[PDB]
Each structure stands twice: as C-alpha cells, then as structure tokens.
Amino acid sequence: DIVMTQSPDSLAVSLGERVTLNCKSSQSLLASSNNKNYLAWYYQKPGQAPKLLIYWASTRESGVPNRFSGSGSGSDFTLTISGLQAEDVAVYYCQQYYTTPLTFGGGTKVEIK
C-alpha cells in the first residue's frame, strides 16, 4: 500500500521561534486531473480527539490562524510553523486520502525544551 513516513520522531525546541516538519510519501499523491494534492495535516492533543490543520495539502482550516503553512507538492510535503505557542505543542500527523486504505503518518511529538 501507500507508506507515509514522517522524517523526525520528535522535536523539542523553545517557544516563540519557528520550526518545520516533513512527511514523505511512498507514492506521488498529486492528482493529475484536479491538479491539487491530498494531505490532511492533523493535530492531536494529549487525551483529545484530533483536529484538522491543513487540507488539500496547502490550505489551512477555518479556526486555524495564519501561523501555519502546508507546503510542497508531488511526494514530499512540509508543514512549516511561523511562531510556536503553548497551545501547539502536541502531536502532528500527515494523512494521505488519495486511496483506500487510509494510512497516517508516524506522529512527530513536538514539545518544549
């Protein structure tokens, strides 16, 4: 099937400065017909149901402020933060929704150092 591999396992940084994260795909998720690409970047808190952050591999969800950016097309994808908050330091996820079975990423647990 389609293997979704996140490149770091964790990222413990300070608060205020930007970070960046990556998710590689074993298969090019760029739909040639729609010319638009298929990533769901999710955010799960400890003990909470997750929520969407990035849909169509680039576009932020309503309720999410301007400090996130889903970026990249083809096979390798990048979630770039611009400013870290205390509300943000929990697990991110990358998801392909191009085919069945729907597979997720490994989950990069970002916390505060």
Partner 1 sequence: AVGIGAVFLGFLGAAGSTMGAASMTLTVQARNLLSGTVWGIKQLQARVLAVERYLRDQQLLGIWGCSGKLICCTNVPWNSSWSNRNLSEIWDNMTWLQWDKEISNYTQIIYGLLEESQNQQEKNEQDLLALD
Does the footprint of partner 1 cover residue 45 (CB under 8 A)? no
The span from the CA of 78 to the CA of 43, in Å, is 14
The span from the CA of 43 to the CA of 56, in Å, is 16
Q: 38, 41, 92, 93: which one contacts partner 1 (CB under 8 A)?
A: 38
Closer of 3 and 102 to partner 1 (Cβ): 102
Q: Is the alpha carbon torsion for 61, 67, 110, 3 positive or negative?
A: positive
Does the footprint of partner 1 cover residue 99 (CB under 8 A)? yes
CB of 89 to partner 1, least distance (A): 28
Residues found near partner 1 in the complex (CB under 8 A): 31, 33-35, 38, 55, 97-100
